[PDB]
Amino acid sequence: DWNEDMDGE
Amino acid sequence: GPLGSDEKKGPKVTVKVYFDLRIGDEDVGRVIFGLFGKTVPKTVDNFVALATGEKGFGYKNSKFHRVIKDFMIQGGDFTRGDGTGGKSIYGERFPDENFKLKHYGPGWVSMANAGKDTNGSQFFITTVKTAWLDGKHVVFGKVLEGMEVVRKVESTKTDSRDKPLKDVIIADCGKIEVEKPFAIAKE
Ligand SMILES: [Zn+2]
C-alpha cells in the first residue's frame, strides 16, 4: 500500500 | 543531521490551496496549505474542489465555527456554519481513505468526522501535535505559509461553546499548481 517517494518514510 | 539519515522525510506536496481570512471586518492574511495528493488523492481532490468552488459550492464565505486554543481551529461547514453541515464532492459524506499520515505537529490539516467513514467538507487545522486523533481522522495536508495567521485565529476570543465572538471567514480561496511535487518534514 505504502509508496516511499510520495508518502514518505 | 547527517543527510543520508535525514533523506530516509514525509509525504510529497502535489498541489496547494490558499485561504484569505477575515476576523470581523479586518483582513488578517493568507494561509497556504500543501496537500498530499498522491497519498490521499480522493481526500485532497475533495478539499481542492471545495476551495476552487468548481462544483458550484464550497468554502468561499464560510466560517471557522470553532476555535480551541492549544488544540485546533475548525471550519468547512458551508451549509449551516455550526458543525452539523457541509457535504463532499462525492455525496453527503465519503469513507476514510487511509490513515497513512499522522497529526505530526502544529499546522497539520485533517478531516472532521462523526465516526468511521463520515468525511464531508469539514476540516481542522491543528495548532499542536494531536496524536490522540491518529488513525481516526484522515490527515491530508500541512500549512506551508501563514502559520502566523492560523495563530491569530487560534487566539481570537470565543464564547463558552468555543465559537468566535467575531466571525472568522474565508474571504477568498483557491488552488495554486505545484509544478514539481516536493517532500516535507513529518513534524
Ligand atoms: Zn540534517
Inter-chain Cβ pairs, chain A and chain B, closer than 8 A? 30
Name all domains of chain B by residue range, CATH numbers in brackets.
1-187 (2.40.100.10)
**Which residues of chain B have a CB within 8 Å of the CB of A9?**
8-10, 186
Please confirm, yes or no, whether B71 is among the known catalytic residues. Answer: yes
Which grid coordinates are listed for B94?
Answer: 465519503
Minimal C-alpha gap between B139 and chain A (Å): 12
Q: Which residue is catalytic, options B46, B66, B101, B119?
A: B66
Residues B28, B152: Cα–Cα separation, whole Å: 8
Cα torsion angle, B20, B24, B25, B26, sign? negative
Residue B45: half-sphere exposure toward Cβ, Cα within 13 Å: 10
Q: How far is the C-alpha of B41 from the C-alpha of B115, rounded, in Å?
A: 21
Method of structure determination: X-ray
Q: Which residues contact B71 (CB under 8 A, 6 or more apart)?
A: B126, B127, B128, B130
B113 is catalytic: yes
What residues have a C-beta under 5 A from ligand 1, the ion? Answer: B 1, 6
The strand ranges marked E within chain B are 12-23, 26-35, 66-68, 72-75, 108-111, 123-126, 139-145, 168-183
Distance CA B151, CA B153 (A): 5
Helices H, strands E: what count in chain B? 3, 8
**What is the Cβ-side half-sphere exposure of residue B31, based on CA atoms within 13 angstroms?**
26
Shortest Cα distance, chain B CAs vs residue A6, angstroms: 5
User: Cα Rg for chain B, rounded, in angstroms?
Assistant: 16
φ, ψ at B130 (rounded to 5°): -125, 65
From chain B, pick out residues whose CB is under 8 angstroms from the CB of A6.
Answer: 11-12, 36, 38-39, 181
- Is residue B5 packed enough to be buried (19+ CB in 10 Å), middle (13-18) or exposed (0-12)? exposed
* DSSP helix/strand/coil, B163: coil
Relative to beta strand B12-23, strand B72-75 is unpaired
Cell numbers describing residue B42: 480522493
Question: Is some CB atom of chain A closer than 8 A to the CB atom of B10?
Answer: yes
